[PDB]
């Protein structure tokens, strides 16, 4: 009964984007085996953010991914010890975001500690000018390699005028204790901003993710 059908989490993010440092604190809950989750994030320091919230939204949880019975949920079995992941997002216009994360279980709830660095975003770009409006539904290709789980995503941000803005994302997931690596498979992800106040200092997110074979 380590990973229950209902689980809350707390997340803390320390970040810097084009030199603007900030902290975010959040609380969330979801049903990990149904692949659904919600959270409410608050910019606790350095607000209001002068950049698009959308570059931060995917850094706030792959334990909440619905799996079929024949795919080993590598990240669920890593608990109670947990796992870490490291991510690089490369944007089409030169913007770069690097993320490291620690995931542990304390008092029956997940604790997420996130560190993010974003650089080289053009001053007139959609990220810095806050011209994005959400991620298109994406597909993460997950595969084992070098004793770790890895994921590749080609993600597209919708823009307010009606265009798109592309990023290439690679993530490495590693359990603290060695657990069974799964075969290669895909993860369909839909990430929605369900609500936000005017200056995006309080944001609510909802995510549905499910794994399937190639």
């Amino acid at each position: 009964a380590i990973i229950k059908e209902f689980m809350r989490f707390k997340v803390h993010m320390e970040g810097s984007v084009n030199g603007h440092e900030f902290e975010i604190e959040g609380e969330g809950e979801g049903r990990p085996y149904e692949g659904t989750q919600t959270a409410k994030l608050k910019v606790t320091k350095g607000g209001p953010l002068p950049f698009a919230w959308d570059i931060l939204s995917p850094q706030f949880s792959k334990a909440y991914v619905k799996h079929p019975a024949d795919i080993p949920d590598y990240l669920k079995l890593s608990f109670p010890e947990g796992f870490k992941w490291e991510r690089v997002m490369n944007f089409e216009d030169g913007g770069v975001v690097t993320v490291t994360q620690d995931s542990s279980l304390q008092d029956g709830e997940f604790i997420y500690k996130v560190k993010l660095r974003g650089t080289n975003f053009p001053s007139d770009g959609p990220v810095m000018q806050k011209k994005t409006m959400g991620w298109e539904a994406s597909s993460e290709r997950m595969y084992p390699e070098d004793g770790a789980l890895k994921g590749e995503i080609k993600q597209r941000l919708k823009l307010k005028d009606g265009g798109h803005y592309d990023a290439e994302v690679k993530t490495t997931y590693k359990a603290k204790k060695p657990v069974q690596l799964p075969g290669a498979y895909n993860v369909n992800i839909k990430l929605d901003i369900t609500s936000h106040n005017e200056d995006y200092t309080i944001v609510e997110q909802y995510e549905r993710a499910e794994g399937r074979h190639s």
Epitope: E92, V96, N120, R141, Y143, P144, E168, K170
Partner: nanobody, 126 residues
């Protein structure tokens, strides 16, 4: 693990075209970024170009811009091409393709940062 095998080189004349291929094989599931390098007989490996692991970003050395073109093969995994148009005798070298997980500004032009290398193929422009 990746094994890179290049082909498509040889002897051409000034102004001709030549498409180099870098066919990869192996047990890996990863899509790798790919870099092209060239080396004169008594020089070091010079950066020619690079394409990101997803193909969304391509970078070119200045002395080949407008003439050279790297592209990924959407059909075959981790195989890329170097299309060389309007060749010059300056372009004579052994050309190499190399693979790496991700491209960064500070690493994509340094040959020592790539883990997997092709055997090299000879491109002579007379």
């Amino acid at each position: 693990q990746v094994q890179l095998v290049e082909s498509g080189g040889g002897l051409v004349q000034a102004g001709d075209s030549l498409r180099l291929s870098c066919a990869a094989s192996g047990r890996t599931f990863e899509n790798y970024a790919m870099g092209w390098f060239r080396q004169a007989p008594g020089k070091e490996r010079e950066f020619v170009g690079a394409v990101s692991w997803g193909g969304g970003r391509t970078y070119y050395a200045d002395n080949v811009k407008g003439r050279f073109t790297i592209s990924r093969d959407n059909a075959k995994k981790n195989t890329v091409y170097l299309q060389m148009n309007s060749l010059k005798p300056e372009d004579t070298a052994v050309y190499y393709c190399a693979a790496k997980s991700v491209l960064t500004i500070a690493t994509m032009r340094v040959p020592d940062e790539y883990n997997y290398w092709g055997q090299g193929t000879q491109v002579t422009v007379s």
